[PDB]
């Protein structure tokens, strides 16, 4: 077990690094972030893994979400003796704690698990501690060029993050997962703050530009105050992770000075 890990997801990579086991990585996926110094090869998109491409890395593990595929490549790895570990990808805090356990076990760093799960819970408590009696309203908008403006309802990492910063997600009862948000619902929900599909979804300009993009925000507090805030897209993938918690803190400071 001289480890050679292909990490197939950003949420895998961060934990592997957090547990001090970066020397075990031989490759990461496109969404993963690792220091330039490591010279780690990429492996593309975990939904389109190349069986032979992976095999040349002589890996011992392929770790990712249940979205790793295609399945025909996963069998070629298994049949060749590569451990293929499907790992948690909920939008829940317990999903994160479970993910930490799943990784700590594979990478044999259980020792670090408790202390890391402990920090994770501390941050969450620190975030929850700052929740007011009168929480504000926050929506996450998933915007694309030529696509209809979507929203994160229940069971999304952006929904969990909004709860953790101590806000209401007005979309979270009525909407499940990511759905088109009717202009009327948005007007009705009256968000105080809008979060946008990555810091990277601009590509538009910024606050005033997303406002240009979604002109009905003008009839919400968020719009009339240009309170349109960027959240790092990596904190939304895999799903609820260390980056998620860090963004959440950073955004709560913006939402409640």
The set of residues, in sequence order, having a beta carbon less than 8 Å from that of 125 and lying 6+ positions away, is: none
Task: Write down the CATH number for the domain with range 1-121.
Answer: 3.40.50.1980
Resolution value in angstroms: 2.4
- Its sign, for the CA torsion 56, 59, 64, 70, is positive
Q: Which helix (H) or strand (E) holds 229?
A: strand 228-230
CA distances from 237 to 14, 88, 89, 92 (A): 11, 12, 9, 12
What span, in angstroms and rounded, lies between the C-alpha atoms of 161 and 211? 22
Contact yes or no for 235/157 (Cβ under 8 A): yes
Count of beta carbons in the 10 Å neighbourhood of residue 118: 10
CA distances from 107 to 101, 103, 158, 167, 235 (A): 10, 6, 29, 36, 22
How is the chain split into domains, by residue range?
Answer: 1-121, 122-257
Contact yes or no for 51/201 (Cβ under 8 A): no
Maximum distance among all Cα pairs of the chain, rounded to whole angstroms: 59
Sequence-ordered alpha helix ranges (H) in the chain = 10-18, 51-55, 71-78, 93-106, 111-129, 157-164, 183-189, 207-213, 221-224, 242-255
Burial class (CB in 10 A: 0-12, 13-18, 19+), 238: buried
Structure tokens that stand for 122 in this block:
């501390």
What span, in angstroms and rounded, lies between the C-alpha atoms of 182 and 187? 9
């Amino acid at each position: 077990s001289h480890m050679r890990i292909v990490s197939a997801g950003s949420a895998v990579t961060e934990l592997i690094l957090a547990l001090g086991a970066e020397q075990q990585l031989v490759a990461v996926d496109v969404t993963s972030e690792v220091p330039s110094s490591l010279n780690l090869p990429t492996v593309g998109y975990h939904r389109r893994l190349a069986a032979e491409g992976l095999l040349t890395l002589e890996p011992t593990h392929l770790i990712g979400s249940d979205e790793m595929g295609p399945d025909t490549a996963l069998q070629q790895l298994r049949s060749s003796g590569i451990q293929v570990n499907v790992i948690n990808s909920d939008s829940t805090p317990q999903g994160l704690l479970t993910r930490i356990d799943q990784i700590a076990q594979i990478t044999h760093t259980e020792q670090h698990a408790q202390k890391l799960k402990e920090n994770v819970q501390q941050q969450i408590n620190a975030l929850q501690a700052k929740r007011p009696e009168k929480p504000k309203k926050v929506l996450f908008l998933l915007l694309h060029e030529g696509r209809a403006a979507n929203v994160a309802g229940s069971d999304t990492v952006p929904d969990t993050i909004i709860g953790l910063i101590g806000a209401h997600n007005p979309a979270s009862p009525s909407i499940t997962s990511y759905k088109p948000l009717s202009m009327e619902s948005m007007i009705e929900m009256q968000p105080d703050m809008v979060l946008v599909s990555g810091r990277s979804l601009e590509k538009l300009g910024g606050a005033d530009a997303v406002l240009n993009a979604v002109p009905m925000l003008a009839a919400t507090p968020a719009g009339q105050n240009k309170n349109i805030v960027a959240i790092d897209g990596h904190a939304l993938v895999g799903g609820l992770g260390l980056k998620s918690l860090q963004e959440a803190q950073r955004i709560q400071t913006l939402l409640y000075p």
